[PDB]
mmCIF file of C-alpha atoms in Angstrom:
data_model
loop_
_atom_site.group_PDB
_atom_site.id
_atom_site.type_symbol
_atom_site.label_atom_id
_atom_site.label_comp_id
_atom_site.label_asym_id
_atom_site.label_seq_id
_atom_site.Cartn_x
_atom_site.Cartn_y
_atom_site.Cartn_z
ATOM 1 C CA UNK L 834 0.000 0.000 0.000
ATOM 2 C CA UNK L 835 3.064 2.170 -0.553
ATOM 3 C CA UNK L 836 3.837 4.583 -3.410
ATOM 4 C CA UNK L 837 0.138 4.952 -4.223
ATOM 5 C CA UNK L 838 -0.544 1.223 -4.323
ATOM 6 C CA UNK L 839 -3.658 -0.222 -2.690
ATOM 7 C CA UNK L 840 -4.902 -3.314 -0.914
ATOM 8 C CA UNK L 841 -8.398 -4.448 -1.807
ATOM 9 C CA UNK L 842 -11.007 -6.874 -0.602
ATOM 10 C CA UNK L 843 -11.219 -9.494 -3.317
ATOM 11 C CA UNK L 844 -14.467 -10.933 -2.106
ATOM 12 C CA UNK L 845 -16.124 -7.535 -2.306
ATOM 13 C CA UNK L 846 -14.754 -7.273 -5.803
ATOM 14 C CA UNK L 847 -16.160 -10.731 -6.473
ATOM 15 C CA UNK L 848 -19.525 -9.367 -5.330
ATOM 16 C CA UNK L 849 -19.549 -6.882 -8.237
ATOM 17 C CA UNK L 850 -18.050 -3.849 -6.562
ATOM 18 C CA UNK L 851 -17.272 -1.129 -9.164
ATOM 19 C CA UNK L 852 -18.121 -3.186 -12.266
ATOM 20 C CA UNK L 853 -19.121 -1.277 -15.393
ATOM 21 C CA UNK L 854 -20.468 -1.781 -18.897
ATOM 22 C CA UNK L 855 -18.675 -0.772 -22.030
ATOM 23 C CA UNK L 856 -20.235 0.184 -25.313
ATOM 24 C CA UNK L 857 -18.817 0.839 -28.772
ATOM 25 C CA UNK L 858 -20.402 1.662 -32.104
ATOM 26 C CA UNK L 859 -19.515 1.204 -35.772
ATOM 27 C CA UNK L 860 -20.930 2.535 -39.012
ATOM 28 C CA UNK L 861 -20.598 2.354 -42.826
ATOM 29 C CA UNK L 862 -22.285 2.876 -46.253
ATOM 30 C CA UNK L 863 -22.289 1.620 -49.882
ATOM 31 C CA UNK L 864 -21.883 3.554 -53.229
ATOM 32 C CA UNK L 865 -19.352 6.274 -52.670
ATOM 33 C CA UNK L 866 -17.071 7.921 -55.243
ATOM 34 C CA UNK L 867 -18.182 6.630 -58.603
ATOM 35 C CA UNK L 868 -21.106 7.165 -60.936
ATOM 36 C CA UNK L 869 -23.249 4.045 -60.915
ATOM 37 C CA UNK L 870 -20.418 2.301 -59.056
ATOM 38 C CA UNK L 871 -22.058 0.765 -56.070
ATOM 39 C CA UNK L 872 -19.938 -1.017 -53.499
ATOM 40 C CA UNK L 873 -21.982 -3.428 -51.457
ATOM 41 C CA UNK L 874 -22.526 -5.238 -48.245
ATOM 42 C CA UNK L 875 -22.625 -8.939 -49.013
ATOM 43 C CA UNK L 876 -21.274 -12.157 -47.550
ATOM 44 C CA UNK L 877 -17.782 -12.798 -49.090
ATOM 45 C CA UNK L 878 -15.668 -15.854 -49.890
ATOM 46 C CA UNK L 879 -12.042 -16.200 -51.015
ATOM 47 C CA UNK L 880 -13.217 -17.448 -54.417
ATOM 48 C CA UNK L 881 -15.890 -14.782 -54.527
ATOM 49 C CA UNK L 882 -13.629 -11.895 -53.491
ATOM 50 C CA UNK H 544 -24.331 45.651 -79.413
ATOM 51 C CA UNK H 545 -22.384 43.872 -82.198
ATOM 52 C CA UNK H 546 -23.870 42.302 -85.348
ATOM 53 C CA UNK H 547 -22.883 39.140 -87.238
ATOM 54 C CA UNK H 548 -22.892 41.022 -90.537
ATOM 55 C CA UNK H 549 -19.946 43.142 -89.400
ATOM 56 C CA UNK H 550 -17.900 40.059 -88.586
ATOM 57 C CA UNK H 551 -19.036 38.541 -91.872
ATOM 58 C CA UNK H 552 -17.994 41.626 -93.841
ATOM 59 C CA UNK H 553 -14.463 41.218 -92.487
ATOM 60 C CA UNK H 554 -14.471 37.563 -93.585
ATOM 61 C CA UNK H 555 -15.770 38.739 -96.999
ATOM 62 C CA UNK H 556 -12.924 41.169 -97.398
ATOM 63 C CA UNK H 557 -10.414 38.327 -97.191
ATOM 64 C CA UNK H 558 -12.456 35.560 -98.847
ATOM 65 C CA UNK H 559 -13.331 37.366 -102.030
ATOM 66 C CA UNK H 560 -9.691 38.183 -102.820
ATOM 67 C CA UNK H 561 -9.225 34.567 -103.935
ATOM 68 C CA UNK H 562 -10.960 34.575 -107.272
ATOM 69 C CA UNK H 563 -8.179 33.922 -109.950
ATOM 70 C CA UNK H 564 -6.415 31.598 -107.548
ATOM 71 C CA UNK H 565 -9.459 29.410 -106.826
ATOM 72 C CA UNK H 566 -9.974 26.374 -109.029
ATOM 73 C CA UNK H 567 -13.114 24.294 -108.699
ATOM 74 C CA UNK H 568 -14.524 21.363 -110.620
ATOM 75 C CA UNK H 569 -18.115 20.654 -109.693
ATOM 76 C CA UNK H 570 -20.325 17.606 -109.965
ATOM 77 C CA UNK H 571 -23.063 19.678 -111.600
ATOM 78 C CA UNK H 572 -21.712 18.298 -114.889
ATOM 79 C CA UNK H 573 -20.534 14.919 -113.521
ATOM 80 C CA UNK H 574 -23.146 13.482 -111.151
ATOM 81 C CA UNK H 575 -25.493 12.311 -113.875
ATOM 82 C CA UNK H 576 -26.723 9.136 -112.146
ATOM 83 C CA UNK H 577 -27.418 9.250 -108.398
ATOM 84 C CA UNK H 578 -30.429 9.502 -105.959
ATOM 85 C CA UNK H 579 -31.570 12.261 -103.632
ATOM 86 C CA UNK H 580 -29.255 12.979 -100.706
ATOM 87 C CA UNK H 581 -31.971 12.727 -98.003
ATOM 88 C CA UNK H 582 -31.543 13.403 -94.269
ATOM 89 C CA UNK H 583 -33.494 13.768 -91.013
ATOM 90 C CA UNK H 584 -33.160 13.868 -87.216
ATOM 91 C CA UNK H 585 -34.768 11.322 -84.878
ATOM 92 C CA UNK H 586 -36.389 12.513 -81.656
ATOM 93 C CA UNK H 587 -35.778 9.857 -78.977
ATOM 94 C CA UNK H 588 -36.998 10.642 -75.470
ATOM 95 C CA UNK H 589 -35.327 9.625 -72.188
ATOM 96 C CA UNK H 590 -36.818 6.978 -69.929
ATOM 97 C CA UNK H 591 -37.516 7.532 -66.224
ATOM 98 C CA UNK H 592 -34.309 5.596 -65.529
ATOM 99 C CA UNK H 593 -32.148 7.575 -67.946
ATOM 100 C CA UNK H 594 -33.563 10.991 -67.181
ATOM 101 C CA UNK H 595 -33.094 10.481 -63.461
ATOM 102 C CA UNK H 596 -29.501 9.250 -63.762
ATOM 103 C CA UNK H 597 -28.008 11.860 -66.097
ATOM 104 C CA UNK H 598 -29.496 14.481 -63.781
ATOM 105 C CA UNK H 599 -28.251 12.622 -60.709
ATOM 106 C CA UNK H 600 -24.718 12.754 -62.039
ATOM 107 C CA UNK H 601 -25.071 16.507 -62.400
ATOM 108 C CA UNK H 602 -26.577 16.854 -58.925
ATOM 109 C CA UNK H 603 -24.173 14.608 -57.002
ATOM 110 C CA UNK H 604 -20.834 15.118 -58.795
ATOM 111 C CA UNK H 605 -20.599 18.852 -57.928
ATOM 112 C CA UNK H 606 -18.423 19.547 -60.952
ATOM 113 C CA UNK H 607 -18.127 23.286 -60.384
ATOM 114 C CA UNK H 608 -16.446 22.810 -57.000
ATOM 115 C CA UNK H 609 -14.161 20.151 -58.412
ATOM 116 C CA UNK H 610 -13.581 23.031 -60.856
ATOM 117 C CA UNK H 611 -14.147 22.896 -64.554
ATOM 118 C CA UNK H 612 -12.155 21.115 -67.208
ATOM 119 C CA UNK H 613 -11.297 18.343 -64.757
ATOM 120 C CA UNK H 614 -11.430 14.611 -65.549
ATOM 121 C CA UNK H 615 -14.786 13.800 -64.007
ATOM 122 C CA UNK H 616 -16.211 17.116 -65.224
ATOM 123 C CA UNK H 617 -15.194 16.476 -68.719
ATOM 124 C CA UNK H 618 -16.110 12.809 -68.335
ATOM 125 C CA UNK H 619 -19.512 14.162 -67.370
ATOM 126 C CA UNK H 620 -19.838 15.577 -70.885
ATOM 127 C CA UNK H 621 -19.475 12.051 -72.220
ATOM 128 C CA UNK H 622 -21.278 10.344 -69.261
ATOM 129 C CA UNK H 623 -24.460 12.271 -69.858
ATOM 130 C CA UNK H 624 -24.406 10.829 -73.409
ATOM 131 C CA UNK H 625 -23.380 7.361 -72.130
ATOM 132 C CA UNK H 626 -26.649 7.194 -70.139
ATOM 133 C CA UNK H 627 -28.187 6.127 -73.465
ATOM 134 C CA UNK H 628 -25.128 4.774 -75.268
ATOM 135 C CA UNK H 629 -24.209 2.221 -72.581
ATOM 136 C CA UNK H 630 -25.221 2.399 -69.434
ATOM 137 C CA UNK H 631 -22.868 -0.541 -68.523
ATOM 138 C CA UNK H 645 -27.250 -2.854 -68.734
ATOM 139 C CA UNK H 646 -29.974 -4.335 -70.971
ATOM 140 C CA UNK H 647 -31.210 -2.205 -73.962
ATOM 141 C CA UNK H 648 -34.640 -1.999 -72.339
ATOM 142 C CA UNK H 649 -33.067 0.765 -70.217
ATOM 143 C CA UNK H 650 -32.124 2.802 -73.324
ATOM 144 C CA UNK H 651 -34.536 4.620 -75.594
ATOM 145 C CA UNK H 652 -31.812 4.722 -78.273
ATOM 146 C CA UNK H 653 -31.297 0.991 -78.208
ATOM 147 C CA UNK H 654 -35.054 0.591 -78.546
ATOM 148 C CA UNK H 655 -35.252 3.019 -81.484
ATOM 149 C CA UNK H 656 -32.448 1.204 -83.293
ATOM 150 C CA UNK H 657 -34.102 -2.114 -82.530
ATOM 151 C CA UNK H 658 -37.406 -0.995 -84.035
ATOM 152 C CA UNK H 659 -35.844 0.578 -87.143
ATOM 153 C CA UNK H 660 -33.671 -2.432 -87.920
ATOM 154 C CA UNK H 661 -36.522 -4.904 -87.461
ATOM 155 C CA UNK H 662 -38.624 -2.780 -89.813
ATOM 156 C CA UNK H 663 -35.836 -2.815 -92.378
ATOM 157 C CA UNK H 664 -35.331 -6.524 -91.695
ATOM 158 C CA UNK H 665 -38.715 -7.127 -93.277
ATOM 159 C CA UNK H 666 -38.191 -4.342 -95.861
ATOM 160 C CA UNK H 667 -34.983 -6.054 -96.972
ATOM 161 C CA UNK H 668 -33.030 -2.804 -96.769
ATOM 162 C CA UNK H 669 -29.289 -2.616 -96.386
ATOM 163 C CA UNK H 670 -28.299 -0.276 -93.651
ATOM 164 C CA UNK H 671 -25.432 1.463 -92.034
ATOM 165 C CA UNK H 672 -24.939 2.278 -88.441
ATOM 166 C CA UNK H 673 -22.873 5.360 -87.672
ATOM 167 C CA UNK H 674 -20.702 5.546 -84.546
ATOM 168 C CA UNK H 675 -17.477 7.422 -83.636
ATOM 169 C CA UNK H 676 -16.111 5.065 -80.900
ATOM 170 C CA UNK H 677 -14.598 1.565 -80.530
ATOM 171 C CA UNK H 678 -15.873 1.266 -77.019
ATOM 172 C CA UNK H 679 -19.233 1.930 -78.591
#
């Protein structure tokens, strides 16, 4: 508990003390820079891509 | 405030100097056996598909901010024609392809020989 270290109660931690949720988002879109050139979301394959 | 006739008059001043130096044989006394040189212009209208897309290019490309005389700007000049020449794309999506179709099938039964006239290998 020296040099800013701490000693904690593991069983209290086990009980859920200070747990938190984490969220993250993603986003995208199709046809970008090209006239009538539409990129697309579609399940790929090494022989298909 | 300036008239065409003035510009023309200047052209006249130069043009009409070349009288004794201009030689010209004409077919008025040669073309003794040929048909009438007939011509006309077809009036094909754009489909919903075509009309929407050539306008969409103009609306979404923003050529004037790209600046003018640039590749996609200039391509636009051809692209707006390609909406009926290509588009990439069954002929049912092109009024021109449908006009050609109808004229050739007519002439198919007429038994007429016919030329197609196009200035491009891609085309």
